[PDB]
Amino acid sequence: SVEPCVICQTRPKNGCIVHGRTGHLMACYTCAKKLKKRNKPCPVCREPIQMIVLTYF
Amino acid sequence: EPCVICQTRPKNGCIVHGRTGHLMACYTCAKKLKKRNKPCPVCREPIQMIVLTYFS
Ligand SMILES: [Zn+2]
Ligand SMILES: [Zn+2]
Ligand SMILES: [Zn+2]
Ligand SMILES: [Zn+2]
């Protein structure tokens, strides 16, 4: 999607939530860290945030 | 923004090296690069890991 981060609605989607061989790119990196830090699941699949990847194009 | 290699499939292959990832290629072209021991196209750094990427 060409939309911004689902949480802050301002920063770009650059926080790949990675769980196994798939990642879910919906949030910015800082909002993705905030979810993981507060022990929140992946917004898309509600599966635990195994790791977060600062994504660039 | 199609895959830079096959110019057809979407960019869904996150080349991951450390905590940063470079999203320029599709997953199957990204596998092909890693398989053949080719570096990351963007930074020419080793492909540690490839991630099939999907949006919300
Ligand atoms: Zn955000
Ligand atoms: Zn997920
Ligand atoms: Zn491709
Ligand atoms: Zn790279």
Residue numbers in the entry:
A (entry chain AAA): 425 to 481
B (entry chain BBB): 427 to 482
Q: Which passages does the manuscript contain on this structure?
A:
The importance of the ubiquitin ligase murine double mutant 2 (MDM2) as a key negative regulator of the tumour suppressor protein p53 has been studied extensively. Second, it promotes the proteasomal degradation of p53 by recruiting Ub conjugating enzyme (E2) thioesterified with ubiquitin (E2~Ub; ~ indicates thioester bond) via its RING domain and mediates ubiquitin (Ub) transfer from E2 to p53,8 where Ub is preferentially conjugated to lysine residues located in the C-terminal lysine rich region of p53.9 Although the relative importance of these mechanisms is context dependent, in vivo mouse studies with ligase defective MDM2 resulted in the same lethality as MDM2 knockout experiments. The RING domain of MDM2 has been discussed as an alternative target to stabilize p53.19 The rationale for this approach lies in MDM2′s ability to still bind and inhibit p53 when MDM2-mediated ubiquitination is abolished, thereby preventing uncontrolled activation of p53.8 The RING domain gains its E3 ligase activity through dimerization with either itself or the RING domain of its catalytic inactive homologue MDMX to form a homodimer or heterodimer, respectively. The dimeric RING domain arrangement is essential for E2~Ub binding and activation as demonstrated by co-crystal structures with UbcH5B–Ub (en dash indicates covalent complex).
Similar to MDM2z, there was no electron density for residues located N-terminal to the RING domain (414–424, corresponding to 423–433 in MDM2h). The major difference is the absence of electron density for the 310-helix preceding the RING domain. The helices are stabilized by a tight hydrophobic packing arrangement involving residues A434 and F490 of each protomer. Both serine and cysteine would likely cause a steric clash and their polar side chains would disrupt the hydrophobic packing, thereby precluding a similar helical arrangement.
